[PDB]
Design a protein around this ligand. Structure first.
Ligand SMILES: [Cu+]
Ligand SMILES: [Cu+]
Lengths: 657, 668
């Protein structure tokens, strides 16, 4: 009764595999009341995968990682199931952590608060009658961290809002108080109540559907005439299960509950020479730290990936109108609390689109009659997830010059808190609507790159543009114009801990010091070009800085070890930030070698958001991007064998008298 | 008889107006042998324009600015023609400047150097026999600045290359020497010859047409399947002559020989309140400073806009497709040296296209059945110009959230110089192909904004993200998470001279201190969000820093005066960089007021390029972008009245499918 093996060792667990895993765990815990928090692929060891792929090695065993809760027991148990033998092969109890909050965990909280007498009383005081609790809503957040309870109970905090009508957007009407909910007992254990009470706003809700806009401004704009994009002869990409082949790239598209999209085993076919570039690339953690110091707002610093899961939160893309053209979809499969497989249909959208000019050059000599123009196509692998108020639109983009870009668009709704009639929002927030305070915050992301640049044994470096040190008027720099790129190769982990610097236009290289470009004499590399790299604004030693040790630097590079995925640790909710785990453990004392070995490159990037009224009641998409581009990887522009859209040589131009 | 007036005072000169202007100038200089360097609109004074537009004032007079050379006179003469009276109304002689190099000025240089005995001898020494001079090519550059001649002669430098076959890309085969050419005498006056001779490369040319690639790698890829764009019901924008209306924006699209595209009189129609945003926005200058200190490479720091002209260099866009989709084109008109109008067809392309999601939100409570999503459309006004080896693709982009973006793509070919067999290219350059040294260089641009944010009387500020100054554990900042935006309003010119700073994620506001957003309490602004802001790497006091005094800071804000367009001065070629002109003049002693007045905001942005083999023999497009976004300008998202691509309310979702006194979440 063992489940069928996948097409490919990195494929996510099938529904049959998930059911097999949960059957096995229920049997192992026979007679105990357990509930499933996470059931997900435990990916093969890096060595095992690579030997299977390239050296005729054995197929790695199919393993399931699980996290469960047991009625009446603190914390969690976790372990591994060997799927071929239907057996639990590793197990341990962690009594003092709390795990990722699932959709089921969060879907239960509104009923809890609506029926709680102490919450009802606070609504009455706040100007909402006791019989109108159906109009009170909350966004159920991780408590994040609260030093009154630590990890001793599993807790949520309910950010409470009011709707006059169920079709309203509730965010114009936050209430003043914050219930704390025991997730497993399903009760309110405390309510944070501010010293200055602010009753519910009496303003109209700030709404945004067409029927609302017609009331607000009189009419919708006329429907614009259509801009139709078609691919009547299909696409150039080919999928074989989860394996993508496009413009010489080949890679595996994976997906899990936490990271969402995971791109693996990325190679480029350089005229028959298939060259590895990356073993794995994904987003591994986030943190969205808010900037109001007033209590209890310090508890808004969601680590969305580790506390809710970019997979668990992902939107089905069918009706989303962001997968246009001829597309390919992938589903995602998770477990529910009962241990049954659940599906998100069309979680991943794959499509190719026009990306402007790839390159062009014309000769002035014959008035540009000698000319070659080639248009670019990009391949886009995307998902969109919803983290209560916000939407994160993630686009992994492959390009025909061999570069890879991550484009993010942020949209959805500002998180809001109540503002008194006479209360000033600034300097920690903006009054984006009457009685609405949209607090300042950052959105920060931890990109995790496991490189294999042109094969094994890699290094990383900071690259800084510098004027020559010789002064103007010296024999060395007579006219003062000389400049160069200073490359600082990181020898130990400590050397790698570095920030973006505008003063040198810093970039970072990930390179293979065992190989040399036969033209330039430099090692083959991919260069990270990324300028949206905010400093972490929370202080050293703050709750934010402690729980996200990775976020303090733009770049952290540590040795590879299997299962080094998550840089705020494996179980993130309610960790105080004290202890050696995640990135803090990997960095250690900073002395380990990272030159010419198997490395892991974690990049912090994102934005700092000071809200303005343009962002409300629904925010226009805000862009974030970074690129990984080949430098000294190829010996020439690798797109030159793409047929031009137009080409005329000099001889041809002359012939056209 | 006088030429017909244009539809609009900001319209570029027509071919009839160009001919009228040059007729008028020829008559004024009766019996003299003159040649036309520039004939272009002299735009109306800002105040006059605005009085005309808004206050019932008179039509500004239609004026043509000209620059001419006269045989046997040094420098230039320039002046103004009043087109309605066909008379020269202002005139002056500038004996000690040199003007923009036109296509005709440049076109004869290659034949000059091919036929020069001293150049032929250097080719022979370099391994190219005299009977192969037809294989020798050069890119004709301005000399930039050479302290041996100043502006006393009008000079070009010829960067020399060799083609084995006319269809080669010549850039794999630079020669080692640099002829200096007198533009008006058409003769070689000097040749810079290096101490270390490097004879011509014996390698195959590094070529890139399909026939070349088939020989190099065996075959081309299969033709990929088409991606087609159609608009079967037409476009959403409306043009009335050069006036554009699209998604509540209205503005004038102008074009000239120098700046290329110029966007004027930009307003947004905010539900009946027509609100000004910018009076004028354009690129006003560039500089592309190379980073090898070895002679004569210091002379590679082209100021492409002021020395050749983004209009004069611009490609006809009919034949790519350069520009894809359903297109409205504009032509450009200039004068040639004889004073006749010339036309560049399809200089400017205008089109709208999909630009991803504009916004989306879904409610988890019913598993995202409650959802709204609206796709974005952008309007693009673009040109592409070729500066010898490089191509600059410029895209002015208007967005439906009210933002305006400038996107640039750089492509074309690296500038290359010869590298000896045993010679190291580094640290000033890269060996991108055998015997080829592609030197380091920056590409820097000066964006000129003449703002009119929600009307008249504007200011500018730097905005810096800062942690609270109170320490972790204080009553003010208990958990150490507090942070805010520090706004520093520029009071005087000197205050404005500011750089991008990664440490604070610096942005800049241009705002109207006379007005206030009734929700946020802040003035209406457009915020410049721009991170591709390199430091100028050339030292203080270098030739580069002196000729481009604007490039030293990311932001320069000076008082408005009429005719403050060009920050490296009006006549750029061969200016040493000494003297009080351009940005140096406008900054003055730094003391002038720029708070709540008419200001001009010059932004330096661009990239630092360290070449790699991927860039050769033809470079993949490298992007640069900056954005100007409304912040506190509107009181809510201005795109919300656009029809959603999909919408379902909670009540609709419930109908679609037909603890605890009160129920919890639908999904519970
Ligand atoms: Cu935000
Ligand atoms: Cu460049």
């Amino acid at each position: 009764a063992a489940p069928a093996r996948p097409a490919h060792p990195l494929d996510p667990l099938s529904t049959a595999e998930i059911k097999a895993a949960t059957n096995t765990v229920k049997s192992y815990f026979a007679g105990k009341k357990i509930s499933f928090n996470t059931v997900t692929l435990r990916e093969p060891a890096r060595k095992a995968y690579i030997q299977w792929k390239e050296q005729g090695g054995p197929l790695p065993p199919r393993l399931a990682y699980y996290v469960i809760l047991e009625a009446g027991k603190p914390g969690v148990k976790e372990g591994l199931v060997d799927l071929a033998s239907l057996s639990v092969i590793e197990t341990r109890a962690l009594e003092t952590v709390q795990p990722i909050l699932t959709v089921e965990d969060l879907c239960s909280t509104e009923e809890v608060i609506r029926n709680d007498p102490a919450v009802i009383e606070q609504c009455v005081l706040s100007g909402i009658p006791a019989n109108e609790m159906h109009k009170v809503y909350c966004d159920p957040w991780t408590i994040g961290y609260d030093e009154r309870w630590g990890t001793g109970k599993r807790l949520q905090q309910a950010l409470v809002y009011y709707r006059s009508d169920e079709d309203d957007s509730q965010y114009s009407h936050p209430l003043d108080f914050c219930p704390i909910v025991d997730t497993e007992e399903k009760k309110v254990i405390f309510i944070d109540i501010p010293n200055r009470r602010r009753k519910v706003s009496k303003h109209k809700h700030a709404n945004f559907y067409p029927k609302h806009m017609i009331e607000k401004v009189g009419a919708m704009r006329p429907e614009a005439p259509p801009i139709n994009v078609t691919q009547p002869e299909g696409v150039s990409f080919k999928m074989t299960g989860n394996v993508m082949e496009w413009s010489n790239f080949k890679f595996h598209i994976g997906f899990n509950y936490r990271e969402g999209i995971v791109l693996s085993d990325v190679s480029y076919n350089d005229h028959g020479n298939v060259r590895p570039i990356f073993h794995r690339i994904s987003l591994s953690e986030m943190i969205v730290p808010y900037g109001s110091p007033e209590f209890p707002h310090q508890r808004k610093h969601a680590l969305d990936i580790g506390e809710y899961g970019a997979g668990y939160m992902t939107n089905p893309l069918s009706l989303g109108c962001d997968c246009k053209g001829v597309i390919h979809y992938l589903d995602a499969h998770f477990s529910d609390r009962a241990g049954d497989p659940i599906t998100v249909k069309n979680a991943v959208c794959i499509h190719e689109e026009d990306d402007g000019l790839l390159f062009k050059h014309s000769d002035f000599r014959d008035n540009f009659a000698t000319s070659l123009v080639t248009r670019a196509t990009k391949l886009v692998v995307s998902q969109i997830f919803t983290a209560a108020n916000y939407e994160y639109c993630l686009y992994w983009v492959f390009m025909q010059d061999g570069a890879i870009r991550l484009d993010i668009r942020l949209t959805g709704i500002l998180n809001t808190y109540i503002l008194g009639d006479d209360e000033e929002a600034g300097p920690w927030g903006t009054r984006v609507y009457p009685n609405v305070n949209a607090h300042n915050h950052q959105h920060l992301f931890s990109l995790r790159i496991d490189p294999r640049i042109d094969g094994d044994g890699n290094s990383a470096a900071a690259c800084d543009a510098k004027s020559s040190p010789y002064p103007l008027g010296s024999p060395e720099n007579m006219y003062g114009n000389a400049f160069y790129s200073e490359k600082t190769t990181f020898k130990t982990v400590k050397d790698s801990l570095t920030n973006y610097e505008s003063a040198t236009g810093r970039s970072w290289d990930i390179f293979n010091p065992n190989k040399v470009n036969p033209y330039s004499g430099k090692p083959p590399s991919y260069k990270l070009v990324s300028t949206q790299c905010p400093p972490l604004l929370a202080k050293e030693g703050s709750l934010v800085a402690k729980r996200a040790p990775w976020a303090s630097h733009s770049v952290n590079v540590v040795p590879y070890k299997d299962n080094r995925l998550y840089p705020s640790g494996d179980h993130v909710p309610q960790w105080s930030g004290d202890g050696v785990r995640g990135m803090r453990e990997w960095i250690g004392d900073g002395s380990e070698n990272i030159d010419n070995t198997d490395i892991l490159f974690f990049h912090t990037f994102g934005i700092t958001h000071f809200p303005a009224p343009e962002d409300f009641p629904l925010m226009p998409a805000e862009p974030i991007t970074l690129m990984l581009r080949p430098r000294h990887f190829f010996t020439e522009n690798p797109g030159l064998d793409i047929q031009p859209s137009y080409a005329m040589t000099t001889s041809e131009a002359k012939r056209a008298v």
